[PDB]
Amino acid sequence: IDLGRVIGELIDHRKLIISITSVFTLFAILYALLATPIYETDALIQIEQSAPETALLQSRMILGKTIDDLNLQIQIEQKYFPVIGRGLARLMGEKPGNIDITRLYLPDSDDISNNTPSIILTVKDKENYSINSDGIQLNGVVGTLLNEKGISLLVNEIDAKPGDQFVITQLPRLKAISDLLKSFSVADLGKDTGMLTLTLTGDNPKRISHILDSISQNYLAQNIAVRIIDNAVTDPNPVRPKKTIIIVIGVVLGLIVSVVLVLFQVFLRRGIESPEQLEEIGINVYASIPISEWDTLLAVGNPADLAVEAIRGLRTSLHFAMMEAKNNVLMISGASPSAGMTFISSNLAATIAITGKKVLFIDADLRKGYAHKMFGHKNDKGLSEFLSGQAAAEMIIDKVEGGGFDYIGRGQIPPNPAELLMHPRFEQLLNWASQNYDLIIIDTPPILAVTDAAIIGRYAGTCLLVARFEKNTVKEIDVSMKRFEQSGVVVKGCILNGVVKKASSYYRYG
Amino acid sequence: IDLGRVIGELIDHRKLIISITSVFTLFAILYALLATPIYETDALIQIEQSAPETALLQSRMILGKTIDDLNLQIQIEQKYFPVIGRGLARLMGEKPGNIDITRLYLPDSDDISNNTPSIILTVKDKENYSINSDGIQLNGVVGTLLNEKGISLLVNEIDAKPGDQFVITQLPRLKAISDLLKSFSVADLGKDTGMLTLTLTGDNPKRISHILDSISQNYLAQNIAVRIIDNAVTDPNPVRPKKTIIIVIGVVLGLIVSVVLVLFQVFLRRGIESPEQLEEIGINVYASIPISEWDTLLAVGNPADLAVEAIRGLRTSLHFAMMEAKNNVLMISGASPSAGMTFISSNLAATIAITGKKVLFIDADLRKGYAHKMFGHKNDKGLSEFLSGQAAAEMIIDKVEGGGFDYIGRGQIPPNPAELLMHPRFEQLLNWASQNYDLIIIDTPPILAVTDAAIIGRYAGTCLLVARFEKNTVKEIDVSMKRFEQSGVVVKGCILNGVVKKASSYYRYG
Amino acid sequence: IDLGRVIGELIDHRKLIISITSVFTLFAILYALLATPIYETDALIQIEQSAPETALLQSRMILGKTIDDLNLQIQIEQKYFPVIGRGLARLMGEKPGNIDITRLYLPDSDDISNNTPSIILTVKDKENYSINSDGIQLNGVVGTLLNEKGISLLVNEIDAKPGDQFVITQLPRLKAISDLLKSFSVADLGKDTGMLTLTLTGDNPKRISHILDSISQNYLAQNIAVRIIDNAVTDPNPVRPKKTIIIVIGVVLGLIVSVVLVLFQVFLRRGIESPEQLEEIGINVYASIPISEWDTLLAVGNPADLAVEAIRGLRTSLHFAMMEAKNNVLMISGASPSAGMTFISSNLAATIAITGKKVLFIDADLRKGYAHKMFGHKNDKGLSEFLSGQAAAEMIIDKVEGGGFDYIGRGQIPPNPAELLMHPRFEQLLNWASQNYDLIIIDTPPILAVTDAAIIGRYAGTCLLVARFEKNTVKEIDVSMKRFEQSGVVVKGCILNGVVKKASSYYRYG
């Protein structure tokens, strides 16, 4: 978790980190390029206090007069069915539509919820056009006033592009004041000077300057019953969205979520990470088999594979460690199903067979052993058919043609695995084989699941646990070795398995 | 209690956590959707100080005149018998009722407690109607004034919906002023400017604007004997309830009570939680039997059950641990009643019997032993009938047909259990059985209750305590082993029992 | 990492440090000498408050009048195709071009994006000239007004130098105000005094004084409908760029990036740095061979080389350490490929051969051994052809003519290296050679890659690891020695190799 570990794991996770940071920055870029620009216009008003005037300009007396003058309760919006149609239309350089209605009158439905009745205008050409309110499309012309079904609408100088849609809202006068007041702002910048820096912000730049001029002139005429130094002009540079600030916030947010998520995943996993985690508990790791990219045995399929090199390292370390053992029986038990126990056992048997010693591979996993499904098999007369007494030692032994070693499958699943393994025929078999073979690899179920491994390991000189690299935890290995000790079985050490090529010391040589 | 433990237990308790948080958020949602909306109207008053004026507007001179003008001491409320009828009626979109009374006069009961006499109006149609005060329903019509029994009520423009009920309260003028003053508010926003931002809040939006206009105009006319810039208009967005703030508070409160309650339950329980709690005290846990979902023996009913796999693990660990013991008698004692002692003893006997050794199961719980109620029994001539000398060793031994092992029940409850067990016939029985059987499992009462276990364990080579997973505490096990030591009995170890499948290492295999 | 280490490594890295600091300071110098100078002019205005006046001077009423007077919306720039052409032109002492246009009128394209239509003027002589807008070059003369294609341009007193290019921009009046306002500044310096210290900054010094005089006089005439104490004069010393501040910032930035980068590289490397790093772990370093600057053996090519002196030191230390060893076989294994293992083994063999003892050099790296590619070879009948049984001990031994020692190459690459080395012929060979030779140096692959070294080291009395100086890490050496221990091989110590002459204690003597 230290800085060195941090940088190593971040480079290991660099794909995820850059992916999520880049996707957030892409969202930031698309938003900052599609967010409608907001322009700001400013005016300067001169008086000879000004504390009241901040509150008279923003009063519904002054603003409401501007709505009554510019007809700001008639709202016009170019229709884009997507949420980003307007932005993309601007990006393509398309001129945005605009029309002028000097007199609009909806049927005054003005319901409690839909107090803002909405109609859609369909432009057909530069002169004639139609409106769809709820289906009845009334064709009209600029100039002449259409008065049908309570629709009194007079549009003039309609825009050029045909086929466009304009949503029209006759929103209430109070709303048309409140939104203006929200977009409007006053300040003093002298704290006693007559200087008032009126600011109004909106999307339509030519419209906001007109609105602010109207506000200033209405305030002037009202105060007559004050000097407008310079009328309102719009700054051509939009003030929102702030493109630079958005993007850097996108980057910082992407990196911060990346860091929190990578630390979350680091504190998520609990499996083994290195042989030294087991060796701290006092467990001799005899090999760290790296994960092989690759039905035949890997030891005879691709003998030059790194996993087979690690298994040969295991063969030599076992050959040293298994001398002085009471007999030549080696019991390999996986710390869990899906620990790679039969992989390791079968290939270790093959690599010891090519050496030239006689190897017997007993699959004493009577519960879900499948070595017969992987070596090519005579399924009749396996191990369970022998412990049940209905077979002899010779009809159960086979020959793996590839690996070059003898093999005893489980046979049929018995209903009483543990009760079968306790039968004295099993020690008979082992005593016979240990005379007629050089090494016997017995392959047993876990010990955290059943007790079979602890029955078999009574007659085995060497017992080894197999742990998958990041699947099994240290707790499982420790509990398994303690449970083996309770039953009088000494687990010599562990075979850590399926270690990633990032963490394996093995590399291709030759 | 660490963060890892915290998250693990919260996911374990996620059902309760999400249930209570969701129910609080549901209460918050129903409240925020049923709480009557409160609208706010604002007006702006201009003067040329204003410190006194904050206190003249809110004076009973100005307000009381508005009550006298708008008849605000006549209260009208649509009747909803539930506490949430009004909210649900609004939610269904129903128009809320309202009527107008320009002249109301109750009989002026005006008692000390009920100084606000209440009557209920029953609307029958758009023109005629009736009132029930205390039973006498007087039928009346809008327009004409009904004057009966001191009821002078003139209602006009009664609402549309028939059959509704309106509770009418002629609350006192002082109350009609005090509530208005509570809902009314003034400020200055310039600290010297003539700007007064009058605000009045209420549920009826069209009514509060009228009230605030009346207040402003009364203040104007009074000050004549000041300028109203813009009259009162109501903001259509209700200011209360604050729906968003309520919901987030509901979520935060649900989570905080969830955390405090889960920590409370964590600090509530004191039972055993893991074998390592016992192993810290120096107690050898020989098995952790997981809780079986499942009258016959589980070892013969469902031999593939996980609990029977754990008992076979116990069988092998005992077989190793019981060699070198002075005799083949195993004494199993529960740390408490309801520790699963007879479950474990019976199934361990069955699993050792299927192996092929001769097992005698003695139920030396002479107080409330019920193995005979569970194996199928000849209740005559049990253990107590033998210690009393009125039976021989042969008429007391039985055969469990399922388990395949011999069995000795307690027989009849004696009046002197401990005094019976001390009789030298019991050691005679054990010395005989230990010659004619391979394993003898004696099943004894607790030691924190009686002394029988410490009498029996004098003749037992191996003694084992059985602790239920979260029922028995570590204190009970420690006190039991110390009390066994005082009596010269060595408790070899413990059998932790009924461990939950969340905490058991056993899993199904095959 | 301590101050002594810091200074030592900085002097070691002084080339990089001074290189990067000098390149940043060179960039700073070129920028500070090419950044266009910015002059500042100041004026003093006297009034009898002045808080409003700070905001009237900077108002678009006053500034816009100055643009309308001096035609500041007509922008003129001498064209330099590089980004630094203007700076270099000034540095060469060239007079900068300038022309005067009293009336300019572009075709008023004024598009949404290109609202600032740009044209380029091509001066041909002191009187006549031409303009290229988008290709159509219209020839014109100073004085007379050319009016073609909507181009109304009247330039007069055009500059001297022919062939120059002037980019002309009729930028909008609002932009011509906003840039001026950005460059303009007012202050009071008395906080109540009428003193206003107007400051205007720009590149053209004669132009900014004229602009500030125009601003002051326009403000004066406006306030008539205030006293200009001293008109605007430009300080001849440019105020930007601040040459001294830039250079010192360049130096400080260069040194700070140098420090952070050298510390980054220090915390980057993880290889061995000294023999004491290995000796801390308990590893006997027997030699530290320094890196030799130099196909024949270095021990016979340049016997006076420092690396050969270090190998003779290794020869004596080995001679002492290898007495009492079980046999005269020395196994040298590199901790990694590219550790210099065959370099060290071959030269140690040569230096022991010149002494006069019989040396056999066995190249038991059957995977990628190349001693035969370096001694001159008969490639037939190597080691692998002997273990396969298809050669005898005599046809595999050779004579290195230079080194003076016998030699056994690997031969052909076998498909089963480890399986070959396990054949009992290898111990036959060693037992024979250890009788017919004084020292046998067996050269083996790594142990972190294959298991061959641990097979060979079973029959070797002394085993030595070879670590490259900064390539191999301490972790590799420790893991290699532990993996050798697992297989029953005792690694006597290490030979640290390729140590830099900065860190080697060896020096030329004689």
**Residue C77 and residue C207: Cα distance in Å, rounded?**
13
Determine whether the interchain pair A449/B507 forms a contact, defined as Cβ–Cβ distance below 8 Å.
yes
Q: Which residues of A touch B508 (CB under 8 A)?
A: 449
Q: What is the dihedral of CA C46, C48, C54, C60, to 10 degrees?
A: -80
Residue C43 pairs in a beta bridge with C198
Please give the C-alpha separations between residue B126 and each of B89, B102, B155, in angstroms, as whole numbers. Answer: 20, 17, 12
CB C498 within 8 A of CB C468: yes
Please name the helix (run of DSSP H) or strand (run of DSSP E) that holds residue B64, with its range, or none. helix B60-70
Count of Cβ atoms closer than 10 Å to residue C454 Cβ: 29
Rg (CA), chain A: 42
C327 phi and psi angles, rounded to 5 deg: -150, 175
The residue among A206, A230, A351, A464 with the most chain C CBs within 10 A of its CB, best to mutate, is A230
Please give the C-alpha separations between residue C59 and each of A216, B141, C67, in angstroms, as whole numbers. Answer: 16, 71, 12
**Residue C225 and residue C239: Cα distance in Å, rounded?**
36
Evaluate whether chains C and B are touching (3 or more beta carbon pairs less than 8 Å apart).
no
C contact set with A (CB within 8 A): 51-52, 54-56, 59-61, 64, 115, 172, 174-175, 178, 337, 367-368, 413, 415-416, 418-419, 422, 445-446, 448-451, 454-455, 476, 479, 483, 486-488
Determine whether the interchain pair C455/A229 forms a contact, defined as Cβ–Cβ distance below 8 Å.
no
Give the CA angle between residues A211, A217, A219 to the nearest 5°: 105
**Residue B128 and residue B434: Cα distance in Å, rounded?**
104
**Residue A43 and residue B338: Cα distance in Å, rounded?**
87
CB B202 within 8 A of CB B212: no
CA atoms within 13 A on the CB side of A20: 15
Tokens 């111990």 identify what position? Answer: C427
Question: How distant is the Cα of A449 from the closest Cα of chain B, in angstroms?
Answer: 5
Q: Which residues of B touch A418 (CB under 8 A)?
A: 312
| Collapsed DSSP state (helix, strand, coil) of residue B442 | strand
Chains in contact with B, counting 3 or more C-beta pairs less than 8 Å apart as contact = A
Q: How many residues does chain A have?
A: 510
**Residue B158 and residue B166: Cα distance in Å, rounded?**
11
Q: Which residues of C touch A195 (CB under 8 A)?
A: 52, 55
Task: Check whether the bond before B241 is cis (ω within 30° of 0).
Answer: yes
CB C137 within 8 A of CB C122: yes
Amino acid A469 reads: F
Nearest residue to C380 via CA among A161, C341, A100, C390: C390
User: How remote is the C-alpha of C395 from its chain's centroid?
Assistant: 55
**Residue C384 and residue A105: Cα distance in Å, rounded?**
103
Please name the helix (run of DSSP H) or strand (run of DSSP E) that holds residue C350, with its range, or none. helix C341-355
Determine whether the interchain pair A509/C454 forms a contact, defined as Cβ–Cβ distance below 8 Å.
no
Q: How far apart are the first and last CA of chain A?
A: 36
Q: How many residues does chain C have?
A: 510
Pair of tokens at residue C195: 């003193």
Nearest residue to A246 via CA among A70, A27, A483: A27
Task: Check whether the bond before A417 is cis (ω within 30° of 0).
Answer: no
User: How remote is the C-alpha of C313 from its chain's centroid?
Assistant: 40
Tokens 């932005």 identify what position? Answer: A87
Task: Check whether the bond before C241 is cis (ω within 30° of 0).
Answer: yes
**Residue A121 and residue A101: Cα distance in Å, rounded?**
12
**Residue C179 and residue C200: Cα distance in Å, rounded?**
11
> In A79-204, where does DSSP find H-type helix?
85-91, 173-183
Q: Which residues of A touch C56 (CB under 8 A)?
A: 46, 229
Residues whose CB falls within 8 Å of the CB of residue B260, separated by 6 or more in sequence, listed in order: none
Q: Which residues of A touch B320 (CB under 8 A)?
A: 486-488
A-chain residue closest to C52, CA distance: A193
Determine whether the interchain pair A451/B189 forms a contact, defined as Cβ–Cβ distance below 8 Å.
no
The residue among C486, C487, C489 with the most chain A CBs within 10 A of its CB, best to mutate, is C486
Amino acid C260 reads: V
**Residue A466 and residue A338: Cα distance in Å, rounded?**
10
Chains in contact with C, counting 3 or more C-beta pairs less than 8 Å apart as contact = A
Pair of tokens at residue A26: 């892409």
Q: Is B275-499 assigned to CATH 3.40.50.300? A: yes
**Residue B182 and residue B171: Cα distance in Å, rounded?**
16
Nearest residue to B95 via CA among B160, B38, B146: B160
Task: Check whether the bond before C82 is cis (ω within 30° of 0).
Answer: no
Pair of tokens at residue B475: 């204190």
Facing residue for A174 by CB, picked from B229, B233, B303:
B233
**Residue A248 and residue A28: Cα distance in Å, rounded?**
9
Q: Which residues of B touch A457 (CB under 8 A)?
A: none
Burial-class residue B179 by CB neighbours within 10 Å (0-12, 13-18, 19+): middle
**Residue B358 and residue B352: Cα distance in Å, rounded?**
8
Q: Which residues of A touch B195 (CB under 8 A)?
A: 52, 55
Count of Cβ atoms closer than 10 Å to residue C244 Cβ: 9
A-chain residue closest to C477, CA distance: A505
Please give the C-alpha separations between residue C298 and each of B125, C309, C312, C404, in angstroms, as whole numbers. Answer: 122, 11, 12, 13
User: How remote is the C-alpha of B184 from its chain's centroid?
Assistant: 43
Cβ contacts from A onto B, under 8 A: 81
**Residue A476 and residue A494: Cα distance in Å, rounded?**
12
DSSP state of B38: B
A443 phi and psi angles, rounded to 5 deg: -120, 120
Question: How distant is the Cα of B470 from the closest Cα of chain A, in angstroms?
Answer: 21
**Residue A153 and residue A170: Cα distance in Å, rounded?**
11
| Collapsed DSSP state (helix, strand, coil) of residue A15 | helix
Pair of tokens at residue B78: 């649509």
Give the CA angle between residues A193, B226, B219 to the nearest 5°: 145
A-chain residue closest to B312, CA distance: A451
Amino acid B69 reads: D
The residue among A54, A479, A486 with the most chain B CBs within 10 A of its CB, best to mutate, is A486
Nearest residue to B228 via CA among B42, B39, B40: B42
**Residue B291 and residue B502: Cα distance in Å, rounded?**
10
**Residue B90 and residue B105: Cα distance in Å, rounded?**
31
CB C481 within 8 A of CB C283: yes
Q: Which residues of B touch A454 (CB under 8 A)?
A: 313, 316-317
A450 phi and psi angles, rounded to 5 deg: -130, 180
Pair of tokens at residue B198: 């009058």
Output C213-222 pairs: Cβ under 8 A, ≥24 positions apart: C213/C43, C214/C66, C214/C69, C214/C70, C215/C57, C215/C62, C215/C63, C215/C66, C215/C184, C216/C43, C216/C45, C218/C62, C218/C65, C218/C66, C218/C69, C219/C45, C219/C56, C219/C57, C219/C62, C222/C56, C222/C61, C222/C62
Q: Which residues of B touch A415 (CB under 8 A)?
A: 303-304
Please give the C-alpha separations between residue A1 and each of A10, A388, C268, in angstroms, as whole numbers. Answer: 11, 55, 17
Cβ contacts from A onto C, under 8 A: 80
User: How remote is the C-alpha of B28 from its chain's centroid?
Assistant: 18
Q: Which residues of C touch A309 (CB under 8 A)?
A: 449-451
Count of Cβ atoms closer than 10 Å to residue B9 Cβ: 15
B166 phi and psi angles, rounded to 5 deg: -120, 115
Spatial strand order in the sheet of B151-156: B100-105, B151-156, B146-148
Question: How distant is the Cα of A193 from the closest Cα of chain C, in angstroms?
Answer: 6
CB-based burial, C15-31: b 16+ in 10 Å, e otherwise? eebeebbeebbeebeeb
Tokens 């490929």 identify what position? Answer: C337
Facing residue for A367 by CB, picked from B46, B355, B509:
B509
Determine whether the interchain pair C451/A315 forms a contact, defined as Cβ–Cβ distance below 8 Å.
yes
Per-position DSSP letters for B325-363, written without gaps between them: -SSSEEEEEESSSSS-HHHHHHHHHHHHHHHT--EEEEE
C252 phi and psi angles, rounded to 5 deg: -65, -40
Q: Which residues of A touch C450 (CB under 8 A)?
A: 309, 312-313, 509
Beta pairing, strands B128-132 & B137-141: antiparallel
Determine whether the interchain pair A368/B510 forms a contact, defined as Cβ–Cβ distance below 8 Å.
yes
Question: How distant is the Cα of B304 from the closest Cα of chain A, in angstroms?
Answer: 8
Question: How distant is the Cα of B250 from the closest Cα of chain A, in angstroms?
Answer: 27
Please name the helix (run of DSSP H) or strand (run of DSSP E) that holds residue C30, with its range, or none. helix C14-34
Spatial strand order in the sheet of C137-141: C74-78, C165-170, C118-123, C128-132, C137-141
Nearest residue to A310 via CA among A66, A82, A39, A506: A506
